[PDB]
Amino acid sequence: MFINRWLFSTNHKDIGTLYLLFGAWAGMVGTALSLLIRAELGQPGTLLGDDQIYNVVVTAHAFVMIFFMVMPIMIGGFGNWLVPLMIGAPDMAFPRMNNMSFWLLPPSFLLLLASSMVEAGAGTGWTVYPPLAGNLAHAGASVDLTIFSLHLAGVSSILGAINFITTIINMKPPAMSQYQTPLFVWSVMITAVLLLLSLPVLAAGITMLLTDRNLNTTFFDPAGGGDPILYQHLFWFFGHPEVYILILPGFGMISHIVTYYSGKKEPFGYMGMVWAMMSIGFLGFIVWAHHMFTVGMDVDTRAYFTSATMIIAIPTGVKVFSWLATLHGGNIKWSPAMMWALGFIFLFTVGGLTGIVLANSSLDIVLHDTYYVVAHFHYVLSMGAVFAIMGGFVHWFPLFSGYTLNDTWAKIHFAIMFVGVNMTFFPQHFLGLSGMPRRYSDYPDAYTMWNTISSMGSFISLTAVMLMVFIIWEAFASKREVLTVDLTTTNLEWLNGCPPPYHTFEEPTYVNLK
Amino acid sequence: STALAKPQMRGLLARRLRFHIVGAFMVSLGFATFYKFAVAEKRKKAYADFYRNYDSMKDFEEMRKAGIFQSAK
Amino acid sequence: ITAKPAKTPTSPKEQAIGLSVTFLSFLLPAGWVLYHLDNYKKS
Amino acid sequence: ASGGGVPTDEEQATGLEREVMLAARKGQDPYNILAPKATSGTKEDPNLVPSITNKRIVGCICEEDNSTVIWFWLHKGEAQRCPSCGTHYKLVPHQLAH
Amino acid sequence: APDFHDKYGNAVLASGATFCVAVWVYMATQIGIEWNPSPVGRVTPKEWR
Amino acid sequence: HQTHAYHMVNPSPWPLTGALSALLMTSGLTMWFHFNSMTLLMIGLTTNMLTMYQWWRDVIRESTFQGHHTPAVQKGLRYGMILFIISEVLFFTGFFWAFYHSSLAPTPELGGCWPPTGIHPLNPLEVPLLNTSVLLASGVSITWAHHSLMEGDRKHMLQALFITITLGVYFTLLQASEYYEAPFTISDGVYGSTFFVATGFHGLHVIIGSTFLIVCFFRQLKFHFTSNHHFGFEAAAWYWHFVDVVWLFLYVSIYWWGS
Amino acid sequence: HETDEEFDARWVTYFNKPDIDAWELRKGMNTLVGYDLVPEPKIIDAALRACRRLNDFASAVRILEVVKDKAGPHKEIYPYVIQELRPTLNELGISTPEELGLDKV
Amino acid sequence: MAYPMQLGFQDATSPIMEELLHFHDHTLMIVFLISSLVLYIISLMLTTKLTHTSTMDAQEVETIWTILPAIILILIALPSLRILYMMDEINNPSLTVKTMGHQWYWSYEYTDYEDLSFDSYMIPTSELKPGELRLLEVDNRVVLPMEMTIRMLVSSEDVLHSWAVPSLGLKTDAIPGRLNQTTLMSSRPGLYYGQCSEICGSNHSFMPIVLELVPLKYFEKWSASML
Amino acid sequence: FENRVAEKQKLFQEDNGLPVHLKGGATDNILYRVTMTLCLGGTLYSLYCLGWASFPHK
Amino acid sequence: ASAAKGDHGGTGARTWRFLTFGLALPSVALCTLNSWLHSGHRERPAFIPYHHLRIRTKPFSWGDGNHTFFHNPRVNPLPTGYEK
Amino acid sequence: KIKNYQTAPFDSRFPNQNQTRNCWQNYLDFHRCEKAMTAKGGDVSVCEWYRRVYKSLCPISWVSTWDDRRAEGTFPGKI
Amino acid sequence: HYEEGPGKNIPFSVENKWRLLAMMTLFFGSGFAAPFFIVRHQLLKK
Amino acid sequence: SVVKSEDYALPSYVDRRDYPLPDVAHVKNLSASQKALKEKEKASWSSLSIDEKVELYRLKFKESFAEMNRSTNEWKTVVGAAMFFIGFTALLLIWEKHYVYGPIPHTFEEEWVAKQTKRMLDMKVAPIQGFSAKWDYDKNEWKK
Ligand code: HEA
Ligand SMILES: CCCCC/C=C\C/C=C\C/C=C\C/C=C\CCCC(=O)O[C@H](COC(=O)CCCCCCCCCCCCCCCCC)COP(=O)(O)OCCN
Ligand SMILES: CCCCC/C=C/C/C=C/CCCCCCCC(=O)O[C@H](COC(=O)CCCCCCCCCCCCCCC)COP(=O)(O)OCC[N+](C)(C)C
Ligand SMILES: CCCCCCCCCCO[C@@H]1O[C@H](CO)[C@@H](O[C@H]2O[C@H](CO)[C@@H](O)[C@H](O)[C@H]2O)[C@H](O)[C@H]1O
Ligand SMILES: CCCCCCCCCCO[C@@H]1O[C@H](CO)[C@@H](O[C@H]2O[C@H](CO)[C@@H](O)[C@H](O)[C@H]2O)[C@H](O)[C@H]1O
Ligand SMILES: C[C@H](CCC(=O)O)[C@H]1CC[C@H]2[C@@H]3[C@H](O)C[C@@H]4C[C@H](O)CC[C@]4(C)[C@H]3C[C@H](O)[C@]12C
Ligand code: CUA
Ligand SMILES: [Mg+2]
Ligand code: NA
Ligand SMILES: [Zn+2]
């Protein structure tokens, strides 16, 4: 029974739970790597070794947080648990293929841990640019193990995207149009279309890197007429959509959490929120060379990528102001999930505004490849994707488990993590403006004060991550069983109770047309 | 005894919002004035003042006599 | 949300134990590696 | 130019596929493929909600084009009302043999 | 009935604040951390050449 | 008992065996490229092939033999297949992008010209034009197969499907022969890299497509298809037209414009 | 759309329906408190008389607590509404939440 | 170079850097103000027991919150793109200097007249002379004439690097097989420092750039002496 | 050839509680075990190969 | 462009069989003649050890590491020229 | 003709940040000119301008590799 | 069927809170310790 | 009374100020005296005692508005515990400095810093605003 239920699953809730467990374990790997980074940097000089071991830690930090923590938790964990329930479907369209998307991830993570054990690791940056990642400067198996880890994670998500798009399009009640599905379901659908179109282009690019490393092709080697810059275009053609894939399910959860704890039946401006997510998904494919403003591109190309990148602020601003309009007039319930969502709104807005600074290429010439970029994206990732995840996890934990957390401990955990991440990242803006580069294991002495404070911040967030583990243990150790939940008439995933039976919607909902 | 007067009972949330969005704006214009004054204008004036009578050869000679250069003793 | 009282209440002492074990499970193994870095490096 | 040898669905469909094809031929919808048309929804003329058990979830799109659907369990017994618009629904249980 | 916060909230707030200030002051001032502050108004420049 | 039309699949070992096959194939290629050994890679190819066979066998059991493909299930599988094709089109777009990037702006190492100095392209009017006629013809004959099947004509469905597969095989053997005859190789700079990796993944897909048509041929021989229900044949026909359209773009781009 | 008077008149009529049932009384009050207003005395009086027809003393008390709540920090509103309702409270024998000690935390 | 506790950009050494500082100030106030407007509008939504929970009409307010951001973006983009096309204008350099990136140091070639080239490596910390800056100084500085337009061309002979000097507003990637151009003009003499700005392996943190800006006649005699 | 799909429909619809991947009978069990053994065995071998490859061979 | 062919008003298999045997297979037969007329070996060009060709940055994982996968001795020189 | 050569002037054929083709074209033009002279017995001094421009712009290692490859018979540009 | 309900829809047992504490310590502690041991490994090599 | 996990699909009781009349009564089963008090409620409410009216309220509802909306001392516990664990963090940082970090580079020695500072002033590092601007080159001291 154990093996049939957990290794042979065809059930969306149990596969969802598999992905949340996987994602939590990866989150501890990515946290440790982040503390190794901040230990290296937390005083001047060398702690671990030179930039090779250091950038192996940095590279793995990114890949683990992106591909093994955030994507599995938002799309495989919350998407699998919530999407079928929110549309009254009895499971995903392809329940067995859904289980292979899950099981591709432990092999993909194994490959990445293999890359770091063999030779001297892949110390390439998560962008894996050649020629540093090619077979002369990174001879031996480490970068090929990295490429194959990304191939497996890519197939897992491409097949996941097919599953979600099909389920969302085909498995709603016959009366429900796509304009009567909840915002989280639209956020998963749009993220899945972004995955479907962007991951195959990354697959093409890293396959070309694999053949340049092992079959004597020269796609990116000028000796054969190749160009290292072509790899950058193909990687970033996927990498920009990838950041919107990381955040969109987060925006979908934030809309539900803000609506729910404002005591509202609906988010403000539902069709504006759908329009904003499709516009950000479409615009997110025509901006990628904002990662390439110092590579030597033409001036008119730099002008178009500056303008197109900026334009994304318009639909994004619609959603921020709509979340404010949803709080407007609410019966505000100051639950710990609500705190996470309010931290999200503020910290995402900070990071989006420093993104707007960077979109100006002439200023990005000075800010590129410095810590100002690191500060921009950790305000949207560590203080947007993570805070949306922690919001959704504390909100829906009683649905998944049937048990309640202690809300006082969860508020304490939010307070420690909010201090910790702002201590860590806020000073990196000053380090970036004054010129400290990225991917450095040590810095000129003038940069010491802000690196010291940033490192001290990272330990406060470590204390929060340890306390989170204790808070989950305490809930399972005390077994306070859920009785009633508020607002089920506009939150269908709760209406089958906590946790819902293994099979739900065996008899579909009744929805009439009129 | 005296009756109480009837108070306003309707649109109280909207009235509070109207009042404060305007005070939210008035701050932004009043902060803009200070941030322009304290940082941006100050910078323009620091650069204009520095270069007004700046003598680059005199600056070079001071550096040269302090022994900073490889190319000039 | 409303919920039943705990089926298996975790007293303050028991929370102190779970919190300490949890913090030690992260702190001790990393602490052991970092304490011994000079040893690994000088080889 | 042409001949036969290819089975038809009438000959060879089986299991649920056959059930759905035979029910459709009779104008019946036991597997809930079609959206039900609403009645005027008053207490005299409630929406009739079929079920194989003692309760079924209803979603009420109270006005055309609302994006918010209102969900609630409808139980066997007296008609119940949507808690947003009040339109009435009544469960009609039984079997899987309509 | 009074709950955990009514009975212990004042003590938790006062001791946690006291402890947090004490240990951060000690860490920041007593254990040899080099903050590298600005030399401006602090350092007397010395001949180097 | 459910009263929706969707398929609750029985719990299955194939997703796990497919996932492990992928670990064995990729760790296998790593051992082949770096540790001089093919062992792990043949174990992974074998288990990948076993997994595909049993999984798709099970889909035929579930559909043809157990009746779980109601119209709602079939409509999902339509979307699934269209989305899969779209992702394969984007995978080839990355190779076309690499081709045009390198050929539109040839660097000094190549002679600052396309084709590079020292490269002698195949003549596009010879075996490449033949391969074009072969795949176009096979798009006509699969269309005949589809109409015969809808018209309930078993014999002409099989005759047209066999013709389509024979042409698939003819293209594959013609390509294998052109690869052997070609005076440039995958190591001949970015011209050989683009040429062989883009036409080589296309050839892999012609092999996959042809395999899928052969599966449809044996299922048709076994009477699995009805004149109205035959999604496996439709999906293989859609994949086959995709392989033909990709060839047309490769022929115009790499063989013709790039000669 | 409508004037404040027309809005008020529609709610007075809603609650004045002689055979209003329990479901309709609760739907009406739980809908009305969603609006940006504290209901006029004349609406509350009609809801309280509906409580009487429905033999529900406790819901009449809860309605007076929701008036107080809807006023938020405008502490002058509730004492004014209780003033305006005193004739009806005395006629129906409705004690206020304060007279019952139900304002004590 | 940066100094301890620094918050903003290094002071401007070139007119283009000056322009960037003023454009940054213009942009940051916006950033300030939007951040502040949001934080504030947020705390306004969260500080009242009054409620209004029924459906709210969105069309009017969405016009405000699409059009006002669009105007703000245009107010940032106008000066932004003016600077972009300014830096791109033709300027007639007096000298061309090449730099090639390597693992891990830079070489410099000044080949307008003679064959002058040399390598430039970080001074190891154990060999710094008193007063010299840890990880910043180099053995052989890139001497250049002040107050003159200089064309720098940048490339690499191995992996990617990127050649940066923050106080001149410069960062140009160093890509093998490619020759990227930038211009450089210092308003003042002095020593202007930068650091390799694309991850390039084990000693990426330790291959800095130091420009030494002096009068033309000093530069000429230094050039002759370096042959 | 003859159309024996009705035969297979009876085989795969028999009420024997078998999952579909074992419902064809004992040959399914054999092919399942062969596949699972090669997958788990190969996975152990791949871990051995990581062990080997994690250390210098000098 | 309609093509130059031309029909409808009924449908399906019969027409697509007519296109298969009347247009598609004929075209394949014609191209097959065209190819098997320009077939047979062309005189290979002088070997020149161009540095953008015969790339070797890592030995191939088969053979002696220096031969491409479908190496043809007649027309594929090694980095040191044609085989003996 | 135009001595007091300081460095290579702006060339509208190559107005963007990538100057690779500027170096290559001048290198070709020089060597093409020098072949055209010498051959026809005329004077290589007329090719001087291309020489000064490519020496200014081209990395030493590119010039050195291209000169090695001309000597080896493996230079892929047409001269 | 399978077990349903709180504590039964998970691949780990919560029947005893101390055995659970041990399993959660092993699970999250192994993920957090791994990169420190990998770094130790890369340092010991050379 | 007693809410069971198995009643999740039934209408339920809730105290919240925005849904004042919940879907069921707080107590539905009545004792003999409670049945007599519900009959008495059919007559004039002026004849109910204050206790009877409170008993009827508490059969229909669990908490009053004043009760359900009460403020609490939880913030003291949250802020104090957060300070505690931020304080615990500085123990970790003390431990790391003592056992993990070695001596930082010799360029941070007081005499090095004084010499480096004068050399920064001699090269006029940031002379417009950031560094040398704050030095008085006439009086040879930091500007006031
Ligand atoms: C969640 C992921 C996410 C999001 C949403 C964004 C959003 C934006 N980002 Fe960024 N970005 C990253 C993740 C993301 N980014 C990552 C991961 C990298 C680098 C990774 C690496 O290099 O390793 C990066 C790098 C990056 C760069 C390259 C910097 C460089 O490397 O030199 C640039 C430059 O244009 C940029 C710009 C922006 C802009 C303009 C936005 C805007 O879309 C933000 C829009 C949002 C707001 C402005 C806030 C809310 C809006 C309002 C309140 C409306 C009104 C306001 C205005 C009209 C201004 N980002
Ligand atoms: C009709 C053609 C069909 C191809 C059949 C031939 C063998 C392999 C089949 C797979 C083809 C797929 C493309 C992979 C890349 C290279 C093969 C290109 C096609 C080919 O076969 O190229 C040959 C070279 O093959 C070589 O190196 C061969 C090296 C063989 C190893 C393949 C390497 C592994 C590829 C990794 C794939 C990763 C894919 C990721 C999926 C993405 C996830 C979303 C050309 O021979 P040549 O002697 O150089 O020149 C001819 C001279 N007379
Ligand atoms: C670049 C930066 C941009 C920043 C932009 C910020 C813009 C702020 C704009 C202000 C909007 C003004 C609306 C005030 C609403 C507050 C609550 C309220 O006051 O509720 C009511 C308003 O709601 C109605 O219906 C009318 C509309 C429906 C409900 C209310 C909708 C508006 C709420 C929007 C709140 C925005 C809050 C945060 C913004 C970031 C008031 O009652 P009425 O007299 O109309 O009833 C009469 C009944 N009728 C309709 C039948 C006639
Ligand atoms: C980046 C995340 C980690 C952050 C901080 C970790 C905080 C430290 C937890 C303590 O870890 C332990 O510390 C002891 C020292 O206090 C070590 O004992 C060492 O030192 C003792 C005292 O010198 C000897 O008795 C022991 O044998 C010797 O192992 C011990 O191995 C290590 O587990
Ligand atoms: C449950 C079923 C699935 C599990 C199967 C597990 C299989 C384990 C067998 C592997 O052993 C072999 O050892 C060979 C000989 O020792 C190796 O050849 C390698 O090493 C040789 C000796 O140095 C070289 O000569 C070879 O060329 C080189 O390929 C090669 O790695 C591998 O074939
Ligand atoms: C044996 C069978 C009669 C088919 C049936 O059971 O109806 C016939 C019908 C169509 C025939 C096939 C088609 O005519 C196409 C092919 C023609 C080749 O000459 C023989 C193999 C070939 C693939 C045929 C084999 C066999 O004779 C088939 C399969
Ligand atoms: Cu060179 Cu980084
Ligand atoms: Mg860069
Ligand atoms: Na360091
Ligand atoms: Zn309704």
Author numbering:
A (entry chain A): 1 to 514
B (entry chain I): 1 to 73
C (entry chain M): 1 to 43
D (entry chain F): 1 to 98
E (entry chain K): 6 to 54
F (entry chain C): 3 to 261
G (entry chain E): 5 to 109
H (entry chain B): 1 to 227
Sentences copied from the publication:
5 is the terminal oxidase of cellular respiration that reduces O2 to water, coupled with a proton-pumping process. The enzyme includes two redox-active metal sites as the low-potential sites (heme a (Fea) and CuA). These sites donate electrons to the O2 reduction site that comprises two high potential metal sites (heme a3 (Fea3) and CuB). The third proton-conducting pathway, the H-pathway, extends for proton pumping from the N-side surface to the P-side surface.
